[model samples]
Target: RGGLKVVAGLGISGVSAVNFLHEQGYQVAVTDSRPTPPGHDQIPAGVKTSFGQLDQELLLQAEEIILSPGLAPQLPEIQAAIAKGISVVGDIQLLRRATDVPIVAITGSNAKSTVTTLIGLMAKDAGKKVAVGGNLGRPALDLLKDQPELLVLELSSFQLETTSHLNAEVAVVLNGYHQAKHRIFQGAKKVVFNRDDALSRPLVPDTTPMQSFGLNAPDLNQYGVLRDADGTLWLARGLQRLIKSSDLYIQGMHNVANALACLALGEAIGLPMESMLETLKQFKGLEHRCEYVKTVHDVRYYNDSKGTNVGATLAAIDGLGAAIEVKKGKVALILGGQGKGQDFGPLRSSIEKYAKVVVLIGEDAPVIEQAIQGATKILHAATLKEAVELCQRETQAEDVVLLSPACASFDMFKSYNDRGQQFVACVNSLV
Candidate 1:
């Protein structure tokens, strides 16, 4: 059944797939639709590449197709290979076959990076050399190079679309992403779920181990948040008080939920609770993921440029909005981009409640303005720089400006990182 593996797309994962198989002594051929796809210069010189197009002749000659997340497996070329009984799988599928290392895998509609990095930091805090990557930072196969004792990966639905039978030691599915997230629990030995989010739960074996977390109180075996009439909100496990939330560097109820999720994940993997708690005190959230920018003229700014979906943008709004709301503050919400066909309807209620003004930008600004139903005053900005200025001009002290676009950044920048950097630059430029 083993034969030459043909890789589709030449992004980071594509390059990792080609390099892994080539070094493992498999004849790997890579083909990309782009004339000069990313990672083109990084591939092994000995490996065959058919750039500028996907070579169908070379495809049928393959034993299996390794699909990159950027390339859809539904394409005519990929489907043609599948019709011939050639298996089409992602790099994660190959990863399962190669390593016996225990994996703590994370995925969600939002906070995938936050939770993934949290669990990895927790694992590292507990003295395990953990390799963390998949949909974040680096490709999964590349993490295998270190041969670490534990693997903690951030998986995207795009990556999971082509991955099969992950067989992970501990699988964490955060937030609600009903469509493709259930795959992570397919062969999971133990699972951590969000108690409040129905979509975060998956149907697993009856005897399988389980844990859960939410913003409210949990049962004896689960994790949750506890707010006393006193003052501090606590990260709790069952009836036990763990840590004070306000002391943590990252702000918001969403992050509290994310922190509790990380605790459950580490617990599933037998990590020490003490180490996990200490790590939380030190860990800040990922860049472009609700990161706090500095204050200018008493107005705060947050870059959630990676909130490229309605769910994430909703979380950012509520998270940061709720935090500042405690100080009698509202928000100046910046939204719009290449919307990727999401219904902007979900955002209306949050905007109406917490936002003072919703600033629209990028290609689909009018689409958002129309679909969002204009609960708050709507402003239009042609660029991110203009958006920042408008937000500052429109807001007061304690009121925050949030750039949770709820769409991909392709229309305005190279990537979400590029979008985030520009937001930081613009925010820092504020006088």
Candidate 2:
């Protein structure tokens, strides 16, 4: 009996939205520019489908339009729908309208998945039933089956662009330079920010409750790191020490910042400090994100293919690069892929300071070389396997070889996960 709804993109989010709509008794159709998108096989049996292009006729008749995160609002069909006053929204917006559960939204250019998973673990440790994932694992609509007491979602800029009514219990923005980050602040009861990065701070009014986390020492109402008289670092909230930084299984200062952010978020949601800290002690970090792969001849290898942009690559270099220096060693950095229009200039100083050699791969390898040409010794490889071989040649004992591509992996691999797995395989094959 409900009016027609059009689900655009037909990807994971699109199919989930379609199924959810059908279950709710709404008439639904799907559209995707791809002739055979990956999730096409899983679309509901009775729903109409327009493959290879947007069907204007079907789009015009819809009372509402649900977009997958990959679909942009500027598309001609989406613009037409907007002009007609049809409600156009993404899966996150649909999820907001469908559920009354409290959400803890996390978004940023980097470390969002890690922080989201960490927060979910803390909630689980505190004995709460939690559902996690939104741009990381399971689609938001699909998570409804758990009927979770708490929802920890890793949102992306694309997902937030169409979401407005998410009134989350707490919204956390890690470090990133994107206007889409501000979307999580909408209707959020409390906001958590990374105090070290100016961009992570939400532009909300002073009256709105706020919390912040950073690597520097914190003041009242903020979370950060502090050093004890014994020269050991501790995660702290103003004057109170919570947990020793050394106890964290996750390496690097970037992860320490992630831990602090999770702590602040958990505290805001009433999770016990002891439980959150316990989760931190055991959490090793997400795979492919600065994950340790193997060591050959005293040379360590790390897979950071999840670093898909310049900001993420920069963080990896700063954190792992410093880790290498502390051990009196250098880094062999593997960089390149689909640059995604990111400027590689910021990578210059980090490369000059940490890297003994740089191996480039994928489509934008030359572009990266041009940006950081004189910063270090640069080499080229046609494949990731070759890149690993080059790293083996360039690295020395006590040195680290890091696969931190400052670009998307689509140019040569199925996804970031594939790239990381291949990197691990290549490292493991070393004699």
The models' CA-based lDDT, in order, is 0.87, 0.87
The clash count of every prediction, one per candidate, is: 0, 0
Q: Write the per-residue lDDT of candidate 1 for residues 378-411, one digit (tens) a residue.
A: 9999889999999999999878889999999998
Q: Candidate 2: misplaced stretches above 4 Å?
A: 176-178, 205-207, 229-231, 292-431
- Residue 359 accuracy (lDDT) in model 2: 97
Q: What's model 1's lDDT at 135? A: 84
Residue 237 in candidate 1 has what lDDT? Answer: 92
